[PDB]
Amino acid sequence: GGRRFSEGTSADREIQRTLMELLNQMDGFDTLHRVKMIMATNRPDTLDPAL
Amino acid sequence: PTRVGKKKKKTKGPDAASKLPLVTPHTQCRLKLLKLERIKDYLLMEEEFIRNQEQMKPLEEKQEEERSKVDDLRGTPMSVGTLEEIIDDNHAIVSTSVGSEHYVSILSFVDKDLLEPGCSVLLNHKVHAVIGVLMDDTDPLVTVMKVEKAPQETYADIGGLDNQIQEIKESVELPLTHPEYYEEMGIKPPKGVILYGPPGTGKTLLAKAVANQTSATFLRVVGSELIQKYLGDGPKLVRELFRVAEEHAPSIVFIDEIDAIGTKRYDSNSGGEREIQRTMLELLNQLDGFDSRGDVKVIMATNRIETLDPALIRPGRIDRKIEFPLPDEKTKKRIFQIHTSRMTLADDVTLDDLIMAKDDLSGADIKAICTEAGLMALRERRMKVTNEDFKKSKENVLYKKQEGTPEGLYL
Amino acid sequence: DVLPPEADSSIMMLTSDQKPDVMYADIGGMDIQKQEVREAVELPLTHFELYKQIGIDPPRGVLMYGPPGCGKTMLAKAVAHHTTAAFIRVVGSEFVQKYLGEGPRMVRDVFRLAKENAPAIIFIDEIDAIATKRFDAQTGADREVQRILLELLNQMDGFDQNVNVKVIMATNRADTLDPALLRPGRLDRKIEFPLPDRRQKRLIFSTIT
Amino acid sequence: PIRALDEGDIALLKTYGQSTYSRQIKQVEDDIQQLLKKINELTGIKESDTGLAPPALWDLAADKQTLQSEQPLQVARCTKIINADSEDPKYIINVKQFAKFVVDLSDQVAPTDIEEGMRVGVDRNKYQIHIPLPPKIDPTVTMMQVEEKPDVTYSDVGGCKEQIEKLREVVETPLLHPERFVNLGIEPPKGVLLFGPPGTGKTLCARAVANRTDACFIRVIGSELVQKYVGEGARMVRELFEMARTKKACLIFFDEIDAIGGARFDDGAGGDNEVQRTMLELINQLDGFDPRGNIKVLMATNRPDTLDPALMRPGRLDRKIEFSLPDLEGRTHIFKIHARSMSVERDIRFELLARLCPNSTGAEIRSVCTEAGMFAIRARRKIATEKDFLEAVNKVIKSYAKFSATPRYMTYN
Amino acid sequence: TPNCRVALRNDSYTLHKILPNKVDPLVSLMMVEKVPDSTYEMIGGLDKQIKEIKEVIELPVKHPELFEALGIAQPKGVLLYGPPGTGKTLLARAVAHHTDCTFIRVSGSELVQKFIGEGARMVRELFVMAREHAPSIIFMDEIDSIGSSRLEGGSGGDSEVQRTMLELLNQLDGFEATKNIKVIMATNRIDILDSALLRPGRIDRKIEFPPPNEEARLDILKIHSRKMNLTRGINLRKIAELMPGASGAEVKGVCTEAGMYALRERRVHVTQEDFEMAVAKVMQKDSEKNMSIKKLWK
Amino acid sequence: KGVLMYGPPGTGKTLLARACAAQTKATFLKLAGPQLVQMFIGDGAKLVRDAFALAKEKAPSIIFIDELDAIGTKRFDSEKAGDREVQRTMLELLNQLDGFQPNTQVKVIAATNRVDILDPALLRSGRLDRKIEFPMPNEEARARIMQIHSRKMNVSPDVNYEELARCTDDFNGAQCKAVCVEAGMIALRRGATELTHEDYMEGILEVQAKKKANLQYYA
């Protein structure tokens, strides 16, 4: 809600506390029955290098 | 009329302490053995006379039938209600805590002259009827702040501050004892007093000595005392604080550590900061805002003064600014003299050894020196205290303040 | 009657499908380091009589450090399979947040949940975030950063608090952080991770293929 | 190598030096403080007597009539009515705290005066309407209608010959001559803010117009708008802006509106939320649909920078009267106000005193006038001299305004 | 008593019994029930520091009539300071094992919680609960938190940290002076706590903890190697000279890691060679590389 | 079916909506922002849904909502209720607006002063969608409005409103009305019967509360 800049004010890992746990726990490593995820967004400024 | 309501029918309750502050030998003399046994004589007789007072009462009538049925007319679990409006046909409307509102009657022996919407009343359960009216209705947070005891000694306790002792006496004691001087010039006495200066100087003592020798009542406020979390609970306690002081005696209010109650009133980004800032902005309103004040004096004290809100420093609110500087080489003698009153002092010592050689240290430092040197005598198996105690004590107390400020640039 | 309690509010207890998802022999050739972590955690948990045979008081905490991707979290996951403990993993980022006071209370929320429970393992994932004092903060909102360490020290080597609590931490370069953490009795173990060398590229290529 | 305590050496101390009067003086002080207690619980005379009338008048009631007013009398409640239906009662009634019933009328009612939205006395068992009520008036606006004159004449607001002139135009002149505005074709402003340094005379101008108003004047306590419950403060705004429409041309004075809302932000997702709901409700009953007509609003603040631009718009606050410091002619008039009612020497001049207060307020000038008489009580006099005031200027201003420029002054003469 | 709970009958709202144990939902952390903690004599080499604490805590409680006859006020403030790992918390637990008194443990960081005003007032409710157990000792953990410095206003520093600190500044030094309640504060960073609770009306004893001497490192080594089982031909004084300024708490780290070498050998025998390898393991350095920083700053 | 007004808070947001209620007969329903907040639980969603069911009973009825940012805020999690009824009033507005198909005849108008409070992804498609911003008057729109409000006075006919737009800058519509009100009373001070260009120039300085002396620099 609003904008996302680099690591200053509330433009922080609030995604990546969830996001790195998704690709761990949603599907792939922790999975059920070859469900498929489709990432789609047009903003990002901060991202994971391990992504 | 001319004398409407005759001003709330209300007396004042002052303190009951200071029974006999005359123990003036101040040493193990037979006078203090004789004086205190006199105090034992009068209080035992005051005990035995009131013991005879509840003993020899052959009077029993127990209500002459009037209040006894009345005490049975009212319910035994007496409850507490709240008026909303007054329908004066002996059938009014009230409100409970939940807001259940009842067309109750007035079961009698209540004059309809001191009941107002807002005044809490007394109710029943079976018929919820108005039996009495609850008086004084103080929330038990302000009654904690009502001092009943004179804690310490009088102005002769502190070690010489007489230029500023005469200042605070002009605004507190002298207008209450002798207000005949002021009508000859029509000048109202000052109201607000700030005590400010470095820590350890005598701010808390000067309030306690006033609270000892007084005649009106006394209220203490410890800093962050009027701060709550319910967003309106903060400013609501301040209204009841000055309400109690106004309803009682022409008394004074001591609010200490007001550096946590004011800093320059800036606007910023935190939401809990504002209920802080709003409570501290209506204290401004109750103090010197709308029409009147009454005979309520306010004494305030900090360590730092420049970080305060300039709306509080202005006259009309506070008319006296009093510095408490660190002592000199003259009144410091009086500090060492008083704190060495009742200790066995060997004749080898000179008080002016530690005074003149070192010229930096507070009054609270000197009390620590006198206690530490007394511990050194028991440390090496002694009763009397010599110079060698004060040589080790003046070291051990002062090693808590850093080495220095700049090298020999200046000369 | 007293119901069976739950203590069920902030659950991170990897217990009983799913903690493990890995066996102990999956890691390729950390043989100095697989032996070293096992001495401080897995060995005193089962063979406690050996330490009492000498009077050792087995060590409390272990600090791992190395480059990002030398197999650090995998070793923590490998312990969680072949232990009988209550494994607790906590990322070092969800308590550096706003709402002044919530940060130090989340440290208390872990250990009150831990010391009420079984012999347990508390794996703090990263403290290459806040781990270093190194100055007196004459600012705002940096003493709140600084005091979470003070709360961490108070419930690590404060009072006794002894029985069967173990703390594992993992970072990058360890010269940055607080020397108050690095005294033994609090962080007894220091383990360095090389990348691989030769003979370790062979072992990881073997096990993956 | 320093240790000096062993239980045998304890018995050395408390026998050396006044073994005669040590406990002999001590337990006398001990049991008398015990006796301070034992008098207090033996008295027990607290006596919180209240509620009771003088016991010479209720004797007729509490003979049988009080017993006659227990069982036949009713504990009926009051409610509100939504509506009714034809040919039958079919009365739909709410409590707003309890449930909503559908009940019958009783026998003692006239079925005409059961209009909608009416407070009615309702039975406890079968919940029938018994007695209709007069409508509810708001209890706390009655508390803040002033009904009282504070005694400040316009002759005490000296130094402000033009700020009163601006303030006379808005408040007083349409209420006494509502002709020249229409007979030329203009409309008076309806909102005036007062801003400036503290202690300058904000409250005085509000206190003096409460004297000469001949109209409804409402002081409003600012922090009554802030409450504990959600939406309660916004409801207090509404009842204020309804009864003002009933009577004609009532004055409403707010004070320190810095407290009741200064800025609207949201970055940390929260904060002063409930304060904003009360503050925005104030705006929509100030401008918007249904303009208010004859309601004049006065506000005053010390920190005008930190206020919302939604209140800075004209149409809500139209005239920005500011208070400044009096130059010289203002201050010489102020000294003659605050020192005419005091015993002074009848030959002193005041223009020399107005020099030595360069940047001063009306509160600081009065503090000099009070302090100079305090020096006369330090000595033994009953009239003030010239040097009494000259020491008072150094006591008030020069003791706090300057300490480096007075001794080391030699750059300026 | 005012502000006291009672038992109320639901029959006729008649009073039944005064209920003790007044409202206090947050003394779970304070006044620890059990003390099977460490003993008094395993401190080992702080005897100057220990005997001063007897003068301020034991002596006024055991014998108050001495200060009556001598004619001085009694002390109540203790500060403990020094580098980390120098026996600051044993001395809290050693006193708490032998105090014969109420011991109230307060760590120095839970006075914050999350709402303004209630994060303060429980400190006032803390010390007034200490009046119930009328002799008491209250202890502070690590005041490098609240108690640091009155900074400026603005959107900097913190108000609420100061709001709690002013109550600590006043419940022991306000209008009402307390009796039979003693405080002990222990932290490093002596110069950055505030100069209003460091005044000698508040804290009377400031006690350092220097790193131990070679004679004192020997005695610390004898305590933790007591249950350790050494063979023969072994000199602790040579090992004590291998520590040029150790902390004292890291003597345990030598004692644990030397016995750890025997554990991996399935052995109970501990030689002197096991210690000399453990000295180089525990003792480390900063290892300041590249030397350009050093020679910019020669 | 969704029209939103936004802009600086002096441009005529409420002033525009009153004219649409004036000339049209189609059952105008005004509604304020903080009216939906009530003290007891669940009362706002009653007040939201009942008015929308009322405006559905009348066919041509349209609804105006002023200060939608009074409730249209970034929703945040809590533990002590507080805002945890406002979203139940907010989502009821969101559920009802997606509850009916976008046909006749219950068009909804909203207007705020600040956009950055509102929930942008919550409108986004078929909710309040049409952006009607109100910019500040440029030059001649200032000179038009000052001519509008000066219709009812005695203006001497040597006054050019273009000359007033030379010196008046960065004003909203309401401050342009405030110059017109204050200039009538300055002529009332000296008892003047009509206005002049000098009378407006002193009324300009009174809006931002200025005054002038002899500044002894300027000969």
Ligand SMILES: Nc1ncnc2c1ncn2[C@@H]1O[C@H](COP(=O)(O)OP(=O)(O)OP(=O)(O)O)[C@@H](O)[C@H]1O
């Ligand atoms: N002038 C004095 N004469 C005698 N005793 C003094 C004097 N000044 C200070 N003291 C000693 O100092 C103590 C009182 O402290 P003081 O009143 O200075 O606190 P304070 O000024 O409120 O300090 P802070 O501002 O740090 O709270 C007393 O115990 C008293 O013995």
Ligand SMILES: Nc1ncnc2c1ncn2[C@@H]1O[C@H](COP(=O)(O)OP(=O)(O)OP(=O)(O)O)[C@@H](O)[C@H]1O
């Ligand atoms: N122009 C003036 N003429 C005479 N007396 C004045 C003047 N200004 C102030 N005073 C005196 O100063 C005292 C305090 O002034 P007052 O509190 O009304 O100022 P204020 O601006 O209302 O303060 P605040 O801004 O804090 O509300 C008044 O009691 C009054 O006697």
Ligand SMILES: Nc1ncnc2c1ncn2[C@@H]1O[C@H](COP(=O)(O)OP(=O)(O)OP(=O)(O)O)[C@@H](O)[C@H]1O
């Ligand atoms: N003189 C000593 N004798 C025996 N053990 C000691 C000594 N000094 C430190 N220790 C050991 O140090 C540990 C206790 O730490 P300590 O009491 O020094 O707290 P601290 O390290 O000062 O606190 P912080 O970590 O905040 O500095 C215990 O394991 C204890 O055995």
Ligand SMILES: Nc1ncnc2c1ncn2[C@@H]1O[C@H](COP(=O)(O)OP(=O)(O)OP(=O)(O)O)[C@@H](O)[C@H]1O
């Ligand atoms: N374009 C315009 N034409 C005529 N008059 C205008 C114009 N703009 C503003 N005004 C005048 O300015 C005043 C402000 O208009 P309005 O009452 O709509 O405020 P607003 O801009 O909606 O304020 P907010 O947006 O803060 O609610 C109106 O009373 C109107 O008389």
Ligand SMILES: Nc1ncnc2c1ncn2[C@@H]1O[C@H](COP(=O)(O)OP(=O)(O)O)[C@@H](O)[C@H]1O
């Ligand atoms: N020595 C190794 N043996 C087997 N797998 C490894 C090894 N090192 C890294 N990996 C793989 O690489 C990934 C590194 O993950 P992780 O340990 O979280 O990185 P980091 O070492 O930065 O914590 C793991 O998923 C693991 O499967």
Ligand SMILES: [Mg+2]
């Ligand atoms: Mg003080």
Ligand SMILES: [Mg+2]
């Ligand atoms: Mg990892």
Ligand SMILES: [Mg+2]
């Ligand atoms: Mg004022």
Ligand SMILES: [Mg+2]
């Ligand atoms: Mg410690």
Ligand SMILES: [Mg+2]
């Ligand atoms: Mg509008």
